[PDB]
């Protein structure tokens, strides 16, 4: 049954790309219209996709894989036979399509109001009030207000969404819908690898936390930061706390050495939206690496309608699987941190045009933390003073510190966040954690991994995971860990491939052919083999390590231990 195997993958192949166009079709018009209309053919769609889905993916349980000869038909067939959602009964996958949609909805359209009538949507207004106000009342206000109204509204439906995305998962095999997500790395020691990564990254975490922790104290009052304690959640300058940079001008290392306001540099010089994304094109053709299609620039919706349409500003990155449209839905606004997120996201445009031409089943990342990884690398590059100053938007080992600094802000205080959502997942999926205690565990996990606290006590019917745009709209997190990790491992690579000597914090990859070969020849492999072939092809050897990551960030390290220590702060939170 050889034979019938080649035969069933050309079929699927053929047949896959027609239905999923079609549905990226409906999905987009849903994400950047959203209707009563978008969303009623969405849903529509979704059983269409499903019925192609069950069809195909029966025909392919029929198929022993075990007896199968070629490895890349096995592969995909073995991928075929996981229906997902499909394999939901008509009438359970009808609730769950609505329950995601509902979810992901009301994510999308809440707001927070004053007592007069101004309300804000979370982006931009509510995201610039959390970056900018350094006044505790109004911090509280926005961090409480969100959760509020858009937290809470996520409660009614996230417990019948675990039953049937977890009903699914043991319809295609699996224990629970986080074993199903886990499934997607191949890789069977996968928990005690990240933890071992996690903890790598606690020196640096925790001493970082414990400086940040300290300028809070000064800035916020002794009455409000306990220096042996967690720092309150709305302080970070981001609404989830993820990243920090926001408050580097709380913590500037050696304010003495001021840096240009590169937010005010860019809306100072007319920079737009789309400026920032052909910039980030000309990176990636810089290295050798293909540009974005003309369809690509008049498409895209690259920066938030002012039609009065509601839509999803979450950024992220559309393979409409023809092989030739690509689009980015991204808000975008005029500042630093998108500039760094329009690279991301055209990383993720650069993986689907490298591996266009494989198996539609194959068109996906080595894992979906490679995926993640190759913008934030180029944006590595970017983000340097040299870099910035060439763009003219800026103007020592003081710089340097100052410039480790606010790259630490980002990095640095996301690896424990990006590593907690998907622990309180995992546990809500596997039965670990029931609806009784969902928020709860949720804090005590912000706790235990970041050394954050709420400002405000939380109580019955709060559920603040759904405050968090991947909660509600179901998408894992995990890959944003493994991003975080391996993309230190890319740049030294690629570094390396550049002919970078000297710290690796100064390197910058711009227009090294070297390097973008060895990205390419990466990304082109698609998910036609298991990760770690990748993960040789760019860094000479295969497993995930922290070493790129701490040698990037050693001499801060150096400082901040020695600063930690005249201050005698007491790491960690008792
Ligand atoms: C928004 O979607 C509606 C369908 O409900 C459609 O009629 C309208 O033209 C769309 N708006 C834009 C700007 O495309
Ligand atoms: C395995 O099948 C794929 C898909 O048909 C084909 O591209 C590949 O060359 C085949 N490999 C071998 C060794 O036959
Ligand atoms: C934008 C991307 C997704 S394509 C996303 O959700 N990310 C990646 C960086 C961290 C992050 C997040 O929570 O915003
Ligand atoms: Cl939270
Ligand atoms: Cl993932
Ligand atoms: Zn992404």
Redesign the pocket.
């Known amino acids: 049954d050889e034979a019938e195997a080649?035969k069933f993958?050309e079929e699927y192949d053929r047949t896959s790309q027609v239905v999923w166009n079609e549905y990226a079709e409906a999905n987009w018009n849903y994400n950047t219209n959203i209707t009563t209309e978008t969303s009623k053919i969405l849903l529509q769609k979704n059983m269409q996709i499903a019925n192609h889905t069950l069809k195909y993916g029966t025909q392919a349980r029929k198929f022993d894989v075990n007896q199968l000869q070629?490895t890349?038909?096995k592969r995909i067939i073995k991928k075929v036979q996981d229906l997902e959602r499909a394999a939901l009964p008509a009438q359970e996958l009808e609730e769950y399509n609505k329950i995601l949609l509902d979810m992901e909805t009301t994510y999308s359209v809440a707001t927070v109001c004053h007592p007069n009538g101004s309300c804000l949507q979370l982006e931009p207004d509510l995201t610039n009030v959390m970056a900018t106000s350094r006044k505790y009342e109004d911090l509280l206000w926005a961090w409480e207000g969100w959760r509020d109204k858009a937290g809470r509204a996520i409660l009614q439906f996230y417990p019948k969404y675990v039953e049937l995305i977890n009903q699914a998962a043991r319809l295609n095999g699996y224990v629970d819908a986080g074993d199903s997500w886990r499934s997607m790395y191949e890789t069977p020691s996968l928990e005690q690898d990240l933890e071992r990564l996690f903890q790598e990254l606690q020196p640096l975490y925790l001493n970082l936390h414990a400086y940040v922790r300290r300028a809070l104290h000064r800035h916020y009052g002794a009455q409000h930061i306990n220096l042996e304690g967690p720092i309150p959640a709305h302080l970070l300058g981001n609404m989830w706390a993820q990243t920090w940079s926001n408050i580097y001008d709380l913590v500037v290392p050696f304010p003495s050495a001021p840096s240009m306001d590169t937010t005010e540099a860019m809306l100072k010089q007319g920079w737009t939206p789309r400026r920032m994304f052909k910039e980030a094109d000309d990176f990636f053709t810089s290295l050798g690496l293909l540009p974005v299609p003309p369809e690509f620039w008049n498409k895209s919706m690259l920066e938030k309608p002012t039609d009065g349409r509601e839509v999803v500003c979450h950024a992220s990155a559309w393979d409409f699987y023809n092989g030739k449209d690509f689009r980015i839905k991204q808000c975008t606004t005029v500042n630093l941190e998108d500039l760094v997120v329009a690279h991301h996201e055209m990383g993720h445009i650069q993986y689907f045009m490298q591996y266009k031409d494989l198996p539609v089943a194959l068109r996906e990342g080595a894992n979906p933390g490679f995926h993640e990884a190759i913008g934030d690398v180029l944006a590595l590059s970017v983000s340097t003073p040299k870099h910035l100053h060439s763009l003219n938007l800026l103007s020592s080992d003081e710089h340097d510190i100052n410039f480790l600094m606010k790259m630490a802000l980002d990095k640095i205080a996301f690896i424990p966040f990006s590593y907690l959502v998907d622990q309180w997942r995992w546990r809500v999926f596997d039965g670990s954690i029931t609806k009784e205690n969902y928020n709860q565990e949720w804090w005590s996990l912000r706790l235990k991994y970041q050394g954050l606290c709420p400002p405000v006590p939380r109580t019955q019917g709060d559920f603040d995971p759904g405050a968090k745009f991947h909660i509600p709209s179901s998408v894992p997190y995990i890959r944003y860990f493994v991003s975080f990790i391996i993309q230190f491992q890319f740049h030294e690579a690629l570094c390396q491939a550049a002919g970078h000597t000297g710290p690796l914090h100064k390197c910058d990859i711009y227009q090294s052919k070297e390097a973008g070969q060895r990205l390419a020849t990466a990304m082109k492999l698609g998910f036609s083999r298991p990760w770690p072939e990748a993960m040789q092809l760019i860094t000479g050897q295969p497993n995930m390590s922290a070493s790129a990551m701490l040698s990037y960030f050693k001499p801060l390290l150096d400082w901040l231990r020695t600063e930690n220590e005249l201050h005698g702060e007491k790491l960690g939170w008792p």
């Open positions: 080649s993958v070629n890349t038909i």
